[PDB]
Coordinates of C-alpha atoms and ligand atoms in Angstrom, one line a residue:
X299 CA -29.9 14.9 -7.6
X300 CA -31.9 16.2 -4.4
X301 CA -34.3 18.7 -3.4
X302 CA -35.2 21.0 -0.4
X303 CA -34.8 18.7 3.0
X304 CA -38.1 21.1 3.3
X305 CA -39.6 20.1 0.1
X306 CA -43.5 19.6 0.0
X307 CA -44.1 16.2 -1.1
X308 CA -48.0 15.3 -2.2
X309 CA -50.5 14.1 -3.7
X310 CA -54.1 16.1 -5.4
X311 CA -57.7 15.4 -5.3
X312 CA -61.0 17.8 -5.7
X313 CA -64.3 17.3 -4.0
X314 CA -66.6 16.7 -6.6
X315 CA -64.4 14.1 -8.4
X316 CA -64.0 12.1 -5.1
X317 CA -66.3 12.7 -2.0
X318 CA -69.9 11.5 -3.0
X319 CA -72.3 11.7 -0.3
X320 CA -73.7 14.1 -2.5
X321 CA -77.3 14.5 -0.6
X322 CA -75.8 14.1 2.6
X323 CA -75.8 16.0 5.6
X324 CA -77.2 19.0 4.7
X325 CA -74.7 18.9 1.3
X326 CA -76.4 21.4 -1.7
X327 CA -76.8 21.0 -4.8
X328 CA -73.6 22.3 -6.9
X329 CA -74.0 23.0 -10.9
X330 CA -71.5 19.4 -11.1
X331 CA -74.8 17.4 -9.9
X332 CA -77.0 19.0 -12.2
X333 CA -74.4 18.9 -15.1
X334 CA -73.3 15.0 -14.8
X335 CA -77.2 14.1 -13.9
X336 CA -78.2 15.9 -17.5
X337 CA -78.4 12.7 -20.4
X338 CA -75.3 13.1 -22.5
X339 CA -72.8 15.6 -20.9
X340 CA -70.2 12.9 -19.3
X341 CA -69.3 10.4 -22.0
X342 CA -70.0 6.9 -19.9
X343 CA -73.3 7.7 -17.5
X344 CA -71.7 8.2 -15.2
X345 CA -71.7 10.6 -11.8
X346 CA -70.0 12.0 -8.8
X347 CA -73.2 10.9 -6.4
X348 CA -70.3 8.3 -5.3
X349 CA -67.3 8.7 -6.5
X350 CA -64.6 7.3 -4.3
X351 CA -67.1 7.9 -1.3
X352 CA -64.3 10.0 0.5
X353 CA -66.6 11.8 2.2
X354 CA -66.4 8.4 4.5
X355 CA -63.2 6.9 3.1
X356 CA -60.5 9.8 3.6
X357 CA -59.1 8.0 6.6
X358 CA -58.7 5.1 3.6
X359 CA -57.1 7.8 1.4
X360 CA -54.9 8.7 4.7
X361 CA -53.9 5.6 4.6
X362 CA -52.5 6.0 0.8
X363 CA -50.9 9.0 0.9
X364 CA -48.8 7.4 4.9
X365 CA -48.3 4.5 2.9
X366 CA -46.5 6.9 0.0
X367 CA -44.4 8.6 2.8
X368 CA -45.8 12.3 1.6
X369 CA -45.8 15.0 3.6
X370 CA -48.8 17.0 2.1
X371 CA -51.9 16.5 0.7
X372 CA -53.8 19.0 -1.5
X373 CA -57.7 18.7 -1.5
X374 CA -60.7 20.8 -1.9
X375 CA -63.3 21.9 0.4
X376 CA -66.8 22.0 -1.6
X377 CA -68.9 24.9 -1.0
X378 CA -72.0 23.2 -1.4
X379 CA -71.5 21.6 1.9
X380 CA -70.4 25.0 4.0
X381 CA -73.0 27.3 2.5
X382 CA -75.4 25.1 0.9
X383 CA -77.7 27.8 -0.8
X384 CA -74.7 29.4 -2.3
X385 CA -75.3 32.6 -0.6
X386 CA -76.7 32.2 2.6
X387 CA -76.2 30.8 5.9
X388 CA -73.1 28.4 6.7
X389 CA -73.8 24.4 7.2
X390 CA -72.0 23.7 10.6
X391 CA -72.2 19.9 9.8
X392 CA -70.2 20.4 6.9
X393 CA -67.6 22.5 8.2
X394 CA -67.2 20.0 11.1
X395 CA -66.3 17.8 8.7
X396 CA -63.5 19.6 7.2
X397 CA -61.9 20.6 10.3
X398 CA -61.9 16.2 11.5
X399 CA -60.4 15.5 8.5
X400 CA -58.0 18.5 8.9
X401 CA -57.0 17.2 12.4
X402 CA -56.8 14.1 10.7
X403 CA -54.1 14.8 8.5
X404 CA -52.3 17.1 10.7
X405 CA -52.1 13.9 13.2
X406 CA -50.9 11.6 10.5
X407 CA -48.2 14.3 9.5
X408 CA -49.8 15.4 6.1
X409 CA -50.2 19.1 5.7
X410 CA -53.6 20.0 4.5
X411 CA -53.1 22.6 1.3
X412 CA -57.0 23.7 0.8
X413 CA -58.2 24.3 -2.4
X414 CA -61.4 26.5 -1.9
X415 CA -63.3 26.6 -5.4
X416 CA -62.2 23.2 -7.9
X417 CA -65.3 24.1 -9.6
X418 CA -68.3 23.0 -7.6
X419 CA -70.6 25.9 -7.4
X420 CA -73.6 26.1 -6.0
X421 CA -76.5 25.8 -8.8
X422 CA -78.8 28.6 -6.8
X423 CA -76.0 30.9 -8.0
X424 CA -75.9 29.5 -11.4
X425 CA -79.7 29.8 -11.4
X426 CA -78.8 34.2 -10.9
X427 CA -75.9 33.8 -14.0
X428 CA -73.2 31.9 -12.0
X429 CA -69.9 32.9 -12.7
X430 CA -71.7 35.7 -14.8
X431 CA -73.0 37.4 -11.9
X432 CA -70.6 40.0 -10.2
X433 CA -72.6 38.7 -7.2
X434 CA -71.1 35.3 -7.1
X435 CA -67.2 36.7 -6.7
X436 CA -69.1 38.2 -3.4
X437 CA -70.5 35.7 -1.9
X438 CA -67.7 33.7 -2.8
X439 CA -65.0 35.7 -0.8
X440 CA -68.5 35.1 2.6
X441 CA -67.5 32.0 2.1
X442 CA -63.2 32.1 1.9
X443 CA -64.0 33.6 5.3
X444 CA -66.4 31.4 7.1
X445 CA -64.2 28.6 6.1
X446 CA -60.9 30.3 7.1
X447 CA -61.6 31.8 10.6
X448 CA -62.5 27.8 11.7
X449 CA -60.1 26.5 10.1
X450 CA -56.9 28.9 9.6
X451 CA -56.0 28.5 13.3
X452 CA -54.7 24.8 11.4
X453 CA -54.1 25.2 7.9
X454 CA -51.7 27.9 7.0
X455 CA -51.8 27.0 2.6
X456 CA -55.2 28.2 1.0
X457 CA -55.3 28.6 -2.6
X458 CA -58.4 30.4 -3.8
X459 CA -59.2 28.9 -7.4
X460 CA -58.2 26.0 -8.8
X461 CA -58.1 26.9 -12.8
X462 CA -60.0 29.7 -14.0
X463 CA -59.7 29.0 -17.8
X464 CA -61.7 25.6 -17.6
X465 CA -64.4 27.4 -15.2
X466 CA -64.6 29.8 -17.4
X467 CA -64.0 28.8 -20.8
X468 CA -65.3 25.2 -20.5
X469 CA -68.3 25.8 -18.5
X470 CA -69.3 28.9 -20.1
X471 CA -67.7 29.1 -23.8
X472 CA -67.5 25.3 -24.7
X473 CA -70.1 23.9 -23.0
X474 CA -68.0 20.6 -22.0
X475 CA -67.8 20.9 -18.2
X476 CA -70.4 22.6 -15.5
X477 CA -72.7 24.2 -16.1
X478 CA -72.6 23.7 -20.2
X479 CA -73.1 27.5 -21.7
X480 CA -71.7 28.0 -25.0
X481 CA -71.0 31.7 -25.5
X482 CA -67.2 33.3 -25.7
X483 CA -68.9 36.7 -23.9
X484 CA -70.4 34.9 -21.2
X485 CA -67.3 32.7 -21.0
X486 CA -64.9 35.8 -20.6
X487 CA -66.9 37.3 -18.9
X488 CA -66.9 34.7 -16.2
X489 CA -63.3 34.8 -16.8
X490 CA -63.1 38.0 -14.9
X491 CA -65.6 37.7 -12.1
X492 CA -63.4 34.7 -11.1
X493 CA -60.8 36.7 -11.4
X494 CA -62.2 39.3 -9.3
X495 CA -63.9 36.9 -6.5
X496 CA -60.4 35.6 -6.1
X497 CA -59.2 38.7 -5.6
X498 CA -62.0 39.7 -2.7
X499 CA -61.7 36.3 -1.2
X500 CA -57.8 37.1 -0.4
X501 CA -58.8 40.3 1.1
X502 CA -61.1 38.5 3.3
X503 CA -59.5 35.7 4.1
X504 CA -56.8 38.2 5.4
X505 CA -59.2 40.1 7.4
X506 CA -60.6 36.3 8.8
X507 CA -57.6 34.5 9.6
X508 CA -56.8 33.6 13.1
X509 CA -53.0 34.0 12.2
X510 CA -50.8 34.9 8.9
X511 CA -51.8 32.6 5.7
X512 CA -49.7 31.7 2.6
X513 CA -52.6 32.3 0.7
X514 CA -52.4 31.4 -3.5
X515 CA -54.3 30.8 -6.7
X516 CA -53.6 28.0 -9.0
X517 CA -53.9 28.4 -12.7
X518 CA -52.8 25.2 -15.4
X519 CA -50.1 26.8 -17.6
X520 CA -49.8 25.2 -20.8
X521 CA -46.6 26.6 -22.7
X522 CA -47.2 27.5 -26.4
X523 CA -44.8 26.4 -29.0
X524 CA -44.9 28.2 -32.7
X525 CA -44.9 24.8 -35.6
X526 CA -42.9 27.1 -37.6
X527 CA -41.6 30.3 -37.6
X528 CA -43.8 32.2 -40.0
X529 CA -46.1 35.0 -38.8
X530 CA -49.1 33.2 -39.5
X531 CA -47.7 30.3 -36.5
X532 CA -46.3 33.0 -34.6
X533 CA -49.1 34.7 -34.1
X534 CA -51.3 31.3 -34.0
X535 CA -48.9 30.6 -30.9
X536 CA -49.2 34.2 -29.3
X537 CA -53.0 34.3 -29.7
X538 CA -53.1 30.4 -27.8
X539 CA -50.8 31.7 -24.7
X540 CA -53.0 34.8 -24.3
X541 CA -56.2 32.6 -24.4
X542 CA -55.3 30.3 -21.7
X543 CA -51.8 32.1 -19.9
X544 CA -51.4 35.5 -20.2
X545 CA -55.4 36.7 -19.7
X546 CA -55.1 35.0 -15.9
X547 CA -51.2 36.1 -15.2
X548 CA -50.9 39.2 -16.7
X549 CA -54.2 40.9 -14.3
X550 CA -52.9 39.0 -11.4
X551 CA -49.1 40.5 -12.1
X552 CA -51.0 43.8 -11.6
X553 CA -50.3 44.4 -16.1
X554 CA -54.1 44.9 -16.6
X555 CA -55.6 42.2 -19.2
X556 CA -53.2 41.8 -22.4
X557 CA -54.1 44.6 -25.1
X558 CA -53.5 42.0 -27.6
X559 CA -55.7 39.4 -26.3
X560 CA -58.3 42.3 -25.6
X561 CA -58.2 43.6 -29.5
X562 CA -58.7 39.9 -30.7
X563 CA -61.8 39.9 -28.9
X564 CA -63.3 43.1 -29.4
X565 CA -66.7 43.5 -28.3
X566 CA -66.3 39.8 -26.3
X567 CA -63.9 41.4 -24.1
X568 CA -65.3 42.0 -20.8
X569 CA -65.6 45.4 -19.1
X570 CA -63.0 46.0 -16.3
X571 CA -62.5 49.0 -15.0
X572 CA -59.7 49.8 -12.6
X573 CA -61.0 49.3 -9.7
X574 CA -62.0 45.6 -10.4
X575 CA -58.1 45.2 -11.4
X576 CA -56.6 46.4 -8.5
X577 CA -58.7 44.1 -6.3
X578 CA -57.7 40.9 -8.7
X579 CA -54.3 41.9 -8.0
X580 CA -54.4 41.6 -4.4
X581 CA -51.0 40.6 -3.1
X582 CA -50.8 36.4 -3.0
X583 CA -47.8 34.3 -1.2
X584 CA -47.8 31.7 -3.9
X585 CA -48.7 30.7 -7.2
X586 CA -49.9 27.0 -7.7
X587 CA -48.8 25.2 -11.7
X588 CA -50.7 22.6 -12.6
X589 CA -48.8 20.9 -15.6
X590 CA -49.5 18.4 -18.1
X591 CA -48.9 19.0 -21.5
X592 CA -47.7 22.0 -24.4
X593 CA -49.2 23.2 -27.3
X594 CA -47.5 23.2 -30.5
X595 CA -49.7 25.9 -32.8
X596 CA -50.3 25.9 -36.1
X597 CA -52.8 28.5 -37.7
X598 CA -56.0 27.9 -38.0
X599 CA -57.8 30.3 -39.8
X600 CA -61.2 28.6 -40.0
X601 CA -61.2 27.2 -36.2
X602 CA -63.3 29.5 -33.7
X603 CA -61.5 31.5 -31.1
X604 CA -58.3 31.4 -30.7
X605 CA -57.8 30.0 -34.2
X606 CA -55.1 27.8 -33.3
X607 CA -54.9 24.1 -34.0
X608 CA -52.3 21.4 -32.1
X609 CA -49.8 19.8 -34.5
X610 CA -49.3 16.4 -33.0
X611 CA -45.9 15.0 -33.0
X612 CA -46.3 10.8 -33.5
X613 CA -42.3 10.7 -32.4
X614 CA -43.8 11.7 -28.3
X615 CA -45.1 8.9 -26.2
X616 CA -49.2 9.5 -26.0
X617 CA -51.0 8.5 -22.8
X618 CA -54.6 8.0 -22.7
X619 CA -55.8 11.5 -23.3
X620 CA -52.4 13.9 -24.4
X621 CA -49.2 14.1 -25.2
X622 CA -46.3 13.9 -23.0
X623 CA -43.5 16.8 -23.3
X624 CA -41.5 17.3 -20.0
X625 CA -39.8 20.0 -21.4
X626 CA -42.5 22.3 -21.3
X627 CA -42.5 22.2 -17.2
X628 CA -39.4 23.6 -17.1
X629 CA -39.8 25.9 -19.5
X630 CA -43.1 27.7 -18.3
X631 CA -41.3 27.3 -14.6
X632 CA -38.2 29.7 -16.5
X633 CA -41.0 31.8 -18.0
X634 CA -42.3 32.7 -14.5
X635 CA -39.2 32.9 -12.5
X636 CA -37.6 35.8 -15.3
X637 CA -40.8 37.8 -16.3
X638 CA -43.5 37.2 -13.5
X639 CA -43.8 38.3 -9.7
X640 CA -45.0 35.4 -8.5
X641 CA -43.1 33.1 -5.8
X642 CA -42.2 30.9 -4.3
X643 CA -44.1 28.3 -6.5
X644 CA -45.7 25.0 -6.0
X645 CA -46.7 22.6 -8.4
X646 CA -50.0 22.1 -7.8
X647 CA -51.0 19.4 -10.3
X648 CA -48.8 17.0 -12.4
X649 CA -49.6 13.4 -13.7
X650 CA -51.3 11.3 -16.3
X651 CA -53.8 9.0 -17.6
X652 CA -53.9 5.3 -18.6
X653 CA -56.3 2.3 -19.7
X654 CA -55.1 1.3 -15.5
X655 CA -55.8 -2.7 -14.9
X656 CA -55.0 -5.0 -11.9
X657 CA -52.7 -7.5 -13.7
X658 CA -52.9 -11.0 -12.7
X659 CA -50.7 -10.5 -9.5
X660 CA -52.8 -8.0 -8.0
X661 CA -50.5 -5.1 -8.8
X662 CA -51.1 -1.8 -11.7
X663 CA -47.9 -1.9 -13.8
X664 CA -48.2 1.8 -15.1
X665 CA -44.8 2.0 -16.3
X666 CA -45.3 5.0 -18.6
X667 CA -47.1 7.0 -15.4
X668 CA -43.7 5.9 -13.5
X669 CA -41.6 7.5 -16.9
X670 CA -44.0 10.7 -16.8
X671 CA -42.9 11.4 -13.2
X672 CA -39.4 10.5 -13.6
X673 CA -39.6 12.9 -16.4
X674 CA -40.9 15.5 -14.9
X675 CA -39.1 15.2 -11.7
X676 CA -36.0 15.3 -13.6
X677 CA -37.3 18.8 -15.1
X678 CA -37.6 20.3 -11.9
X679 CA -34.7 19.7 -10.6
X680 CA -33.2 21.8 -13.6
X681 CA -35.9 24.4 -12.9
X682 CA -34.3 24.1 -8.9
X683 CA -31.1 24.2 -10.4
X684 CA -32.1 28.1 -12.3
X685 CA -33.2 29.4 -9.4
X686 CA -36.8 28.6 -9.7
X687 CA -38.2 29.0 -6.2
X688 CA -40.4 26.0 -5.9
X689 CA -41.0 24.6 -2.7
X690 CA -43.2 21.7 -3.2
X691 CA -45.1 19.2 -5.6
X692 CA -48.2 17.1 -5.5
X693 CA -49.1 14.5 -8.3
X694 CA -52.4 14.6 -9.5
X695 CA -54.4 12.5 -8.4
X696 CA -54.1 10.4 -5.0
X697 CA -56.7 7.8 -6.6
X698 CA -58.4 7.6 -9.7
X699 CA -61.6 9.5 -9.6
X700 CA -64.8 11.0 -11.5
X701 CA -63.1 12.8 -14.7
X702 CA -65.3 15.3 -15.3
X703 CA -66.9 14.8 -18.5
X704 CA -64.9 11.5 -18.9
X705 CA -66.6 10.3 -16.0
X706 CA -64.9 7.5 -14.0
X707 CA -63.6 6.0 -17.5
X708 CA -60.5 8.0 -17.4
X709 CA -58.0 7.2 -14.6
X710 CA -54.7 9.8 -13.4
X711 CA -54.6 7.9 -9.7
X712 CA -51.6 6.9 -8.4
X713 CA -53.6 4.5 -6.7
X714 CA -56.1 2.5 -8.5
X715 CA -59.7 2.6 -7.4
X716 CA -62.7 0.1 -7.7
X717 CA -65.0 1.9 -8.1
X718 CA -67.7 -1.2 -7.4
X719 CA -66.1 -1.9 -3.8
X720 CA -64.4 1.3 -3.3
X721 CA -61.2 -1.0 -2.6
X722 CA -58.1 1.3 -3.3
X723 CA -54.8 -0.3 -4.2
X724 CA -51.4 1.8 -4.9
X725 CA -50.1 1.5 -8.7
X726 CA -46.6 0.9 -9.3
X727 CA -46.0 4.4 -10.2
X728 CA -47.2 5.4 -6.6
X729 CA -44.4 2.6 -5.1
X730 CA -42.0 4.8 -7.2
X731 CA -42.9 7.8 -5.5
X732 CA -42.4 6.4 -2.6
X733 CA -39.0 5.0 -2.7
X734 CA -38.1 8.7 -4.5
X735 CA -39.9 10.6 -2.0
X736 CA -38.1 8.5 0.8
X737 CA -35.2 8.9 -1.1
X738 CA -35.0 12.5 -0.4
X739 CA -36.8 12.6 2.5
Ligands
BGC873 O1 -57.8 16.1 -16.4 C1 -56.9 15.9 -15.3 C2 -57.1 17.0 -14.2 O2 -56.9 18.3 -14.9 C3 -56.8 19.4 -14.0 O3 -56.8 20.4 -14.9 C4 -57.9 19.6 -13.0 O4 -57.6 20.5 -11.9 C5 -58.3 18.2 -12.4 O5 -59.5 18.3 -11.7 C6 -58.5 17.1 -13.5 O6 -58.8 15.9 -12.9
NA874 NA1 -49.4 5.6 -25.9

């Protein structure tokens, strides 16, 4: 029935999907500006060069997540605004910024959990290989320090990444997000020099801090179901949870990269030597889940990498964009509590997409968004219930935002935003939260 008194309650967002103000004060350009500016990469025309314009409306977005009762509220910081150049010097003005709307939130009672890299990087370093330049994990942990000695005197929950398989394998192997390379080497090989600048930003963000951090990363876990039991599906299934699980936890748990996972790739694999391994496994206070959806594997012999098709199942509610199977959240939660290091836990990320209208009353009736987190909710408390040490959720998102290469089409809010006036208005599913949050609360 309840959780923690002590539970974090709270709602995500990212920079790049929200702020706007994208030329403004001194604000650089990341590989998201170039990427949604190129004809044809997000699916409507559209960019972030608005957004939600946060970057003057999060005292509006304040105002949501008071008005939801949370006590949290997980956001990013974008690098292009503290070191505009990528490497280089720092951009007071944009720090400044952070820390007001850090005092902000610590005034309204929201504590601020800092995402430093949801996927904004600065195109000069894409412009020297990006994410497959070793140079980039370095100037990355510059600037996890510049950002944490002014503000780590006030915000105490830092997560490094957010979600190194898309970075890696959608910007680099794909092609479908930032910055659009379509290469498995490059891809894994950015795979590990994101793995490796998280690594060095702990370190320094250690040796910055004004006083002790609970310092994470926060990696989407999508748990991996065989569609039968023959080898072929087995293997289908194990080949999918190396791709996207086990090749982030398994270096982080200190296990070195998954031999399997590095014999399917052969000469893709990149080259890690033990030195870069130890330094990815530098000791973190959390691990962030962000949870949506499983995979149900068939083989796939004639797919590329991992060779591994979904096997829809038309008996599961579909929202806009997947399907819905609370189930998996508290399985992958079991997973980690028996045969990983990590805790406590947070989830980091957990919600869902809808064709979101105001209805002729002025409200959002997003009943099956309401369903999802009742789901879900319900999930964790049998996680709780296990022995799962999880301390806190956030629903993704706070407001619906720019999707990536959806654009502003495709809306996870739990508060609907028009995008024309920049109005915000809270969806039913939000009001939900709220009465559950203060519920337990
Ligand atoms: O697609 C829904 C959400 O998925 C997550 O994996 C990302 O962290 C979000 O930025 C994105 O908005
Ligand atoms: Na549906």
């Amino acid at each position: 029935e309840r959780f923690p008194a002590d539970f974090v309650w709270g709602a995500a967002t990212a920079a790049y999907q929200i702020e706007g103000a994208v030329r403004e004060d001194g604000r650089g350009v990341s590989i998201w500006d170039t990427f949604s500016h190129t004809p044809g990469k997000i699916a409507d025309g559209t960019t972030g060069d608005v957004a939600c314009d946060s970057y003057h409306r999060y005292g509006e977005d304040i105002g949501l997540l008071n008005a939801l009762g949370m006590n949290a509220y997980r956001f990013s910081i974008a690098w292009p605004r503290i070191v505009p150049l990528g490497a280089g010097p720092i951009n007071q003005a944009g720090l400044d910024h952070y820390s007001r709307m850090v005092d902000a939130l610590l005034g309204a009672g929201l504590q601020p959990f800092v995402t430093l890299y949801h996927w904004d990087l600065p195109q000069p370093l894409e412009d020297r290989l990006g994410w497959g330049s070793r140079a980039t994990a370095t100037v990355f942990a510059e600037y996890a320090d510049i950002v944490v000695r002014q503000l780590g005197d006030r915000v105490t929950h830092w997560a490094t990444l957010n979600e190194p398989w898309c970075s890696a394998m959608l910007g680099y192997y794909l092609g479908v997000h930032a910055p659009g390379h379509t290469d498995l080497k490059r891809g894994l090989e950015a795979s590990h020099n994101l793995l490796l600048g998280h690594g060095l930003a702990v370190q320094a963000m250690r040796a910055a801090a004004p006083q002790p951090l609970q310092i994470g990363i926060v990696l989407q876990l999508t748990p991996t179901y065989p569609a039968s039991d023959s080898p072929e599906d087995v293997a289908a299934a194990r080949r999918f949870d190396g791709f996207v699980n086990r090749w982030f936890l398994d270096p982080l748990a200190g296990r070195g990269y998954p031999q399997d996972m590095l014999d399917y790739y052969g000469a893709a694999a990149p080259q890690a030597n033990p030195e870069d391994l130890t330094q990815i496994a530098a000791p973190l206070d959390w691990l962030g889940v962000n949870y949506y959806e499983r995979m149900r594997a068939v083989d796939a012999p004639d797919a590329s990498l991992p060779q591994a098709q979904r096997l829809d199942d038309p008996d599961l509610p579909h929202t806009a964009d997947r399907e819905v199977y609370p189930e998996g959240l508290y399985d992958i939660l079991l997973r980690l509590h028996n045969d990983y290091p990590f805790r406590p836990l947070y989830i980091t990320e957990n919600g869902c997409a809808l064709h979101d209208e105001i209805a002729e009353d002025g409200g959002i009736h997003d009943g099956q968004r309401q369903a999802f987190f009742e789901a879900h909710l319900a999930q964790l408390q049998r996680a709780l219930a296990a022995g799962v040490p999880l301390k806190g959720y956030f629903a993704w998102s706070l407001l619906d935002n720019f999707e990536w290469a959806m654009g502003l089409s495709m809306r996870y809010g739990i508060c609907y935003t028009n995008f024309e006036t920049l109005e915000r208005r809270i969806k039913d599913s939000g009001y939900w939260l709220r009465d559950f949050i203060a519920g337990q609360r």
